[PDB]
Design an enzyme around this catalytic site. Structure first.
Site, PDB file in Angstrom:
ATOM      1  N   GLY A  33      14.978  27.572 -45.717  1.00  0.00           N
ATOM      2  CA  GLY A  33      16.016  28.400 -45.134  1.00  0.00           C
ATOM      3  C   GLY A  33      15.692  28.800 -43.715  1.00  0.00           C
ATOM      4  O   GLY A  33      16.544  28.745 -42.831  1.00  0.00           O
ATOM      5  N   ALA A  34      14.442  29.202 -43.513  1.00  0.00           N
ATOM      6  CA  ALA A  34      13.962  29.711 -42.237  1.00  0.00           C
ATOM      7  C   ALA A  34      12.471  29.960 -42.344  1.00  0.00           C
ATOM      8  O   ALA A  34      11.953  30.139 -43.437  1.00  0.00           O
ATOM      9  CB  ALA A  34      14.687  30.994 -41.872  1.00  0.00           C
ATOM     10  N   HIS A  86      15.418  39.333 -42.454  1.00  0.00           N
ATOM     11  CA  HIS A  86      14.288  38.891 -43.283  1.00  0.00           C
ATOM     12  C   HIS A  86      13.169  38.348 -42.402  1.00  0.00           C
ATOM     13  O   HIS A  86      12.005  38.715 -42.554  1.00  0.00           O
ATOM     14  CB  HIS A  86      14.759  37.810 -44.284  1.00  0.00           C
ATOM     15  N   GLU A  87      13.536  37.477 -41.472  1.00  0.00           N
ATOM     16  CA  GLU A  87      12.567  36.828 -40.603  1.00  0.00           C
ATOM     17  C   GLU A  87      11.890  37.820 -39.674  1.00  0.00           C
ATOM     18  O   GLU A  87      10.723  37.658 -39.329  1.00  0.00           O
ATOM     19  CB  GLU A  87      13.218  35.686 -39.822  1.00  0.00           C
ATOM     20  N   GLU A  98       6.764  38.307 -49.044  1.00  0.00           N
ATOM     21  CA  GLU A  98       8.142  37.976 -49.402  1.00  0.00           C
ATOM     22  C   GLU A  98       8.941  39.114 -50.016  1.00  0.00           C
ATOM     23  O   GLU A  98      10.122  39.276 -49.712  1.00  0.00           O
ATOM     24  CB  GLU A  98       8.191  36.733 -50.289  1.00  0.00           C
ATOM     25  N   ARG A 131       9.160  21.700 -53.131  1.00  0.00           N
ATOM     26  CA  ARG A 131       9.693  22.783 -53.945  1.00  0.00           C
ATOM     27  C   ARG A 131      11.113  22.472 -54.431  1.00  0.00           C
ATOM     28  O   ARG A 131      11.422  22.635 -55.619  1.00  0.00           O
ATOM     29  CB  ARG A 131       9.680  24.063 -53.105  1.00  0.00           C
TER      30      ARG A 131
HETATM   31  N1  LIG Z   1       8.865  31.410 -45.869  1.00  0.00           N
HETATM   32  C1  LIG Z   1      10.034  30.500 -46.071  1.00  0.00           C
HETATM   33  C2  LIG Z   1       9.793  29.558 -47.259  1.00  0.00           C
HETATM   34  C3  LIG Z   1       9.077  28.274 -46.855  1.00  0.00           C
HETATM   35  O1  LIG Z   1       9.276  27.819 -45.708  1.00  0.00           O
HETATM   36  O2  LIG Z   1       8.331  27.708 -47.692  1.00  0.00           O
HETATM   37  C4  LIG Z   1      11.348  31.265 -46.267  1.00  0.00           C
HETATM   38  O3  LIG Z   1      11.373  32.411 -46.711  1.00  0.00           O
HETATM   39  O4  LIG Z   1      12.429  30.748 -45.989  1.00  0.00           O
HETATM   40 ZN   LIG Z   2      10.102  35.070 -46.284  1.00  0.00          ZN
END
Ligand SMILES: N[C@@H](CC(=O)O)C(=O)O
Ligand SMILES: [Zn+2]
Ligand SMILES: *[C@@H]1O[C@H](CO)[C@@H](O[C@@H]2O[C@H](CO)[C@@H](O[C@@H]3O[C@H](CO)[C@@H](O)[C@H](O)[C@H]3NC(C)=O)[C@H](O)[C@H]2NC(C)=O)[C@H](O)[C@H]1NC(C)=O
Ligand SMILES: *[C@@H]1O[C@H](CO)[C@@H](O[C@@H]2O[C@H](CO)[C@@H](O[C@@H]3O[C@H](CO)[C@@H](O)[C@H](O)[C@H]3NC(C)=O)[C@H](O)[C@H]2NC(C)=O)[C@H](O)[C@H]1NC(C)=O
Ligand SMILES: *[C@@H]1O[C@H](CO)[C@@H](O[C@@H]2O[C@H](CO)[C@@H](O)[C@H](O)[C@H]2NC(C)=O)[C@H](O)[C@H]1NC(C)=O
Ligand SMILES: *[C@@H]1O[C@H](CO)[C@@H](O[C@@H]2O[C@H](CO)[C@@H](O)[C@H](O)[C@H]2NC(C)=O)[C@H](O)[C@H]1NC(C)=O
Ligand SMILES: *[C@@H]1O[C@H](CO)[C@@H](O[C@@H]2O[C@H](CO)[C@@H](O)[C@H](O)[C@H]2NC(C)=O)[C@H](O)[C@H]1NC(C)=O
Ligand SMILES: *[C@@H]1O[C@H](CO)[C@@H](O[C@@H]2O[C@H](CO)[C@@H](O)[C@H](O)[C@H]2NC(C)=O)[C@H](O)[C@H]1NC(C)=O
Ligand SMILES: *[C@@H]1O[C@H](CO)[C@@H](O)[C@H](O)[C@H]1NC(C)=O
Ligand SMILES: *[C@@H]1O[C@H](CO)[C@@H](O)[C@H](O)[C@H]1NC(C)=O
Ligand SMILES: [Ca+2]
EC number: 3.4.11.7
Length: 875
Positions: free
Chosen positions: A282-283, A318-319, A341, A808
């Site tokens: 996602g990001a 979030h980021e 997370e 994943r």
């Molecule tokens: N940390 C990333 C997950 C990943 O890139 O594995 C996210 O929350 O989108």
């Molecule tokens: Zn994250």
């Protein structure tokens, strides 16, 4: 060849974990991409603090090869003689052996290890890679990295563990037409040829390998300046420049809010955001250079939905959280991943709530994280928040509902229990204490225990060191007892073994008569507790604030149904959603009679709020799908629920009027009307679809998805399918593209769905990032449920080869089998799994979907007649 593979196990490199005594301090990293060739070379110099006698130095490396025999330096400066290098595949190490062995770094001097490497930019979305896009008819290139969790080692050789924080100075040699970005600002740019440029970035603060990021691009930029006076820019394709505006606004607003909330400065001089045209997650929160999938960053107010707007806002927020929680303070080991997370998934709602005030974001936490993960965490095949991981596949697997949603949910409970103010201060202190270092979960409790003096460790350990959650059983209105809640009544409640024995310290809140009281329900109160003027009704767990379910006495439930029918506003929107969610989950678990749960849906013709409708739709979607093939039950359920949404669907109409939450309500309410087969709603969809096919009319943004889906489903044919496919290619906006892919997946035609599946192997049409999304959409189609399932089996070898078992999304694709509910289908799943027993990152999803399908089979056997009687008697 140069560092050949060896099966030599007789060393410390046989261990999965890096040794305690070898530590990096500084990385000097240089990479030079050959963009048109899909290759890159690089050299890396690492300063190493050695703590113990060793004849071997080793670190992580995958696929990318060492090209020159590495050279090592003593802290004095002398060249250390090197016997051999070799790769150890089993644990993804490259090991070098000094003839002799050398001793600890005693003073301020360090060893220096430099190695030369070559890797590929093609056939992958991890490590350092290249992808393309079209601009004014020309094919352009962009190269970027993506490392989380164990992919930095593909980009360049490194100590690829979150706690091996080092400082970074990165340089890139690239063609001059290209700009270069990394974590830090540009320090200097020097001409190599009249064709190549070498961009060197200034020294980074200490950081983990997975956060290291660089990119080579020809993007434009939209710019903003924080209250700090630091530049905040979003890089974007010139064509798409106008769609970066909203993200630019949210970044500004949420950046300013968080710096003030966490009482701590953003550790870097600049922050960049960029969306890679083909991006695997996602990001990614790469410090100062956050990478995005386009759907999560780029928004057009003229074309994108409110749903999209909120998504962009939430992911950006979030980021940003990660810049503090994750970047400044990192988990010691992936077992504590939720410290990153969970925190990000929690504070994201506070961020956006500041930016957009009438979005009711805090309430939406219930819809986004809390209630959905209470489904997940009621399975035997869930796992505790603090998870034992021993392979890269296990590591990547735990980026899941538990880490994100349950992490978020238990912080939400914690904040409310401990009070926001103290929670805020406690977070600040933790952030001060472990800044630029690593923390364990135990460290965070102690930080909040210092801020509230409440027993945080004692209470939160129960929520954190074991899977699952309790249901509170109400006896006599006022006595409560706790019991583990499991969706499968046959399952052993004591498994898998837990030191805490599946009892919790539950912070319990209730509403007496608009007056709220609090009690901690102690674990050792084995025979339950009693909740403290003489009462006729107790509202337990207001706004579903605590991570548990409440099971009232049946008479109470009966009274709630009646109260809803008389005046539903007696309960808050959140409370209605919560009661409905609990009842239907309880019924699913055989802890409450379905007739009692169904009775709560009777009032719905008068329901007008978002939250209760969303949880109603969630619950009905499951029941309806279990009876899809049941010609007796299905029509009756359809008829009833059609009648229950009709008023709100009709009231809101087919038009984008009202505030944010209203528009979200209209989407899901009109969608459900369509799903339930409302002729008038379906005709609206067809009519609009027909108009859209005329090529001019721009559909109302919040109705588009529905129009593409139900329009294609009801009146789609090859001509309109081909047209839609052309439109998908032609639009630049990823958010529109995604809707069109769902539309294409909706056609009721085996031949056309077959063509569509074939397009998945065509990288010119479907991006690598979108393959699994498309498969999942097709699986929703009444014909395609089976087609997608059959296609992933036939093409399993192909998918594994293309994505690897460490992917994943590939691991998770088996969850398309969730709606399965017969012994025949379960046998198919088990047969396929037995044929391809190497599951990689799919190991947990396999376990979960098997449990779900087994539950579905039992559910049908237990509840068909009960549910049939309720509907038959009513209609
Ligand atoms: N940390 C990333 C997950 C990943 O890139 O594995 C996210 O929350 O989108
Ligand atoms: Zn994250
Ligand atoms: C999109 O959906 C709309 C519903 O949301 C449709 O509008 C409805 O059409 C119905 C038939 O044309 C109307 O039914 C009448 O309702 C009144 C009650 O107000 C009754 O007396 C009648 O039994 C009934 N039929 C009559 C008198 O002939 C709906 O009133 C009407 N409007 C609403 C707001 O529900 C749209 O037609 C539909 N659009 C398309 C293109 O299909
Ligand atoms: C909570 O759920 C209860 C269980 O379903 C509801 O009670 C049922 O209501 C039905 C009437 O809507 C009755 O069903 C049938 O009624 C028809 C009349 O058209 C009769 O022919 C049938 O004989 C009858 N069915 C049976 C099996 O006798 C039921 O009488 C009744 N069920 C029971 C067990 O009493 C409640 O109404 C509901 N409570 C609410 C909404 O508060
Ligand atoms: C990226 O492309 C390279 C070069 O085309 C791929 O390596 C080739 O793989 C094919 C088929 O397996 C072999 O026939 C060639 O001999 C290989 N070429 C070289 C130079 O080794 C490589 O597999 C691709 N990378 C990824 C990650 O898929
Ligand atoms: C980003 O922020 C700006 C200003 O905060 C938003 O405001 C626009 O600009 C003027 C004056 O600043 C306002 O009167 C208008 O309401 C806004 N729109 C237009 C078209 O002028 C702007 O809307 C924000 N960008 C978004 C949400 O994409
Ligand atoms: C599904 O789509 C296919 C492809 O359009 C349909 O097959 C076409 O049928 C028409 C006549 O009805 C022929 O003129 C075309 O040549 C056919 N195309 C192909 C590829 O065979 C098919 O009829 C549709 N099926 C259903 C059930 O609607
Ligand atoms: C719709 O799109 C397809 C794909 O572009 C058209 O083309 C045919 O596709 C089949 C495979 O599905 C090929 O075997 C044929 O060679 C294609 N025919 C060509 C290129 O002339 C299909 O004709 C289109 N149909 C309509 C009605 O527009
Ligand atoms: C922190 O932020 C303040 C206020 O914006 C600023 O004046 C100061 O330079 C920063 N301090 C540190 C130690 O980074
Ligand atoms: C609830 O618990 C209390 C104390 O254990 C007891 O007095 C009472 O009888 C119990 N039952 C009910 C139905 O209130
Ligand atoms: Ca990643």
């Amino acid at each position: 060849d140069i560092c050949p593979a060896s099966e030599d196990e007789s060393g410390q490199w046989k261990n999965f974990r890096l040794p305690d005594f070898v530590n990096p301090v500084h990385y000097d990293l240089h990479v030079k991409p050959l963009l048109e060739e899909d290759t890159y070379t690089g050299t890396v110099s690492i300063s190493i603090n050695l703590s113990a006698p060793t004849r071997y130095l080793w670190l992580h490396l995958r696929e990318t090869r060492i090209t020159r025999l590495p050279e090592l330096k003593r802290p004095s400066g002398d060249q250390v003689q090197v016997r051999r290098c070799f790769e150890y595949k089993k644990q993804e190490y490259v090991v070098v052996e000094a003839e002799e062995e050398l001793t600890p770094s005693s003073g301020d001097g360090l060893y220096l290890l430099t190695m030369e490497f070559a890797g590929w930019l093609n056939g992958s979305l991890v490590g350092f890679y290249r992808t393309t896009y079209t601009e004014n008819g020309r094919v352009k290139s962009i190269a970027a990295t993506d490392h989380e969790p164990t992919d930095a080692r593909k980009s360049f050789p490194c100590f690829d563990e979150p706690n091996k924080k080092a400082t970074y100075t990165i340089s890139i040699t690239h063609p001059k037409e290209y700009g270069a970005l990394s974590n830090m600002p540009v320090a200097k740019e020097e001409s190599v040829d009249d064709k190549w440029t070498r961009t060197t970035f200034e020294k980074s603060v200490p950081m983990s390998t997975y956060l290291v990021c660089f990119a080579v691009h020809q993007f434009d930029s939209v710019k903003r300046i924080s209250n700090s006076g630091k530049p905040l820019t979003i890089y974007v394709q010139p064509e798409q420049k106008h769609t970066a505006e909203y993200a630019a606004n949210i970044t500004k607003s949420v950046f300013d809010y968080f710096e003030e909330y966490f009482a701590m400065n953003y550790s870097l001089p600049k922050l960049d955001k960029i969306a890679i045209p083909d991006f695997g997650t996602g990001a990614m929160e790469n410090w100062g250079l956050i990478t995005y999938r386009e759907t999560n960053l780029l928004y057009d107010p003229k074309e994108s939905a409110s749903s999209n707007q909120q998504r962009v806002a939430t992911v950006v927020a979030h980021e940003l959280v990660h810049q503090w929680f994750g970047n400044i303070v990192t988990m010691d080991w992936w077992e504590d991943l939720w410290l990153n997370e969970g925190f990000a998934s929690f504070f994201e709602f506070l961020g956006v709530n500041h930016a957009e005030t009438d979005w009711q974001m805090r309430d939406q936490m219930l819809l986004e994280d809390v209630l959905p993960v209470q489904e997940d965490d009621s399975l035997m095949s869930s796992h505790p928040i603090i998870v034992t991981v021993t392979t890269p596949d296990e590591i990547t697997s735990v980026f899941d509902g538990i880490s994100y949603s349950k992490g978020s949910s238990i912080l939400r409970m914690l904040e409310d229990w401990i009070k926001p103010e103290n929670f805020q201060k406690g977070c600040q202190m933790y952030l001060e204490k472990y800044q630029f270092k690593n923390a364990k979960t135990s460290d965070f409790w102690a930080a909040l225990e210092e801020a509230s003096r409440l027993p945080v460790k004692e209470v939160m350990d129960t929520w954190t060191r074991q899977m699952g959650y309790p249901v509170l059983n109400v006896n006599g209105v006022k006595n409560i007892t706790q019991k583990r809640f499991l969706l499968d009544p046959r399952a052993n409640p004591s498994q898998p073994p837990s030191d805490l024995g599946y009892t919790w310290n539950i912070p319990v809140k209730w509403t007496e008569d608009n007056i709220t009281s609090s009690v901690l329900f102690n674990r050792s109160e084995k025979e339950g507790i009693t909740l403290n003027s003489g009462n006729a009704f107790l509202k337990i767990n207001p706004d579903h604030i605590g991570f548990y379910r409440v099971n009232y006495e049946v008479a109470t439930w009966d009274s709630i149904a009646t109260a809803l029918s008389l005046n539903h506003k007696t309960f808050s929107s959140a409370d209605r959603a919560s009661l409905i969610d609990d009842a239907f989950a309880l019924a699913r678990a055989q802890l409450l009679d379905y007739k009692v749960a169904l009775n709560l849906t009777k009032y719905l013709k008068r329901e007008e709020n978002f939250l209760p409708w969303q949880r109603v739709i969630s619950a009905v979607t499951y029941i309806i799908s279990m009876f899809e093939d049941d010609k007796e039950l299905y029509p009756m359920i359809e008829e009833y629920f059609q009648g229950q949404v009709k008023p709100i669907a009709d009231s809101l109409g087919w038009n984008d009027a009202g505030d944010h939450v209203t528009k979200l309500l209209r989407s899901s309410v009109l969608g459900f009307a369509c799903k339930m087969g409302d002729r008038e709603a379906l005709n609206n969809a067809s009519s609009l679809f027909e108009q859209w096919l005329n090529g001019t009319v721009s559909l109302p943004v919040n109705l588009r998805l529905l129009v593409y889906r139900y329009g294609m489903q009801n009146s789609g044919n090859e001509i309109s399918w081909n047209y839609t496919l052309e439109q998908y290619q032609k639009t630049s906006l990823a958010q529109e593209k995604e809707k069109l892919l769902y539309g294409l997946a909706s056609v009721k035609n085996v031949t056309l769905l077959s063509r569509y599946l074939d397009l998945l192997k065509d990288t010119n049409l479907i991006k690598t990032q979108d393959v699994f999304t498309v498969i999942r959409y097709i699986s929703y189609n009444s014909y395609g449920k089976n087609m997608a399932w059959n296609w992933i089996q036939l093409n399993w070898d192909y998918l594994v080869n293309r994505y690897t078992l460490n992917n994943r999304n590939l691991g998770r694709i088996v969850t398309i089998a969730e709606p399965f509910n017969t012994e025949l289908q379960l046998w198919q799943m088990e047969s396929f799994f037995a044929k391809y027993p190497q599951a990689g990152a799919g190991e947990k999803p396999r376990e979960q979907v098997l449990e779900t399908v087994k539950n579905n089979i039992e559910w049908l056997k237990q509840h068909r007649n009960t549910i049939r009687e309720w509907f038959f008697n009513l209609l």
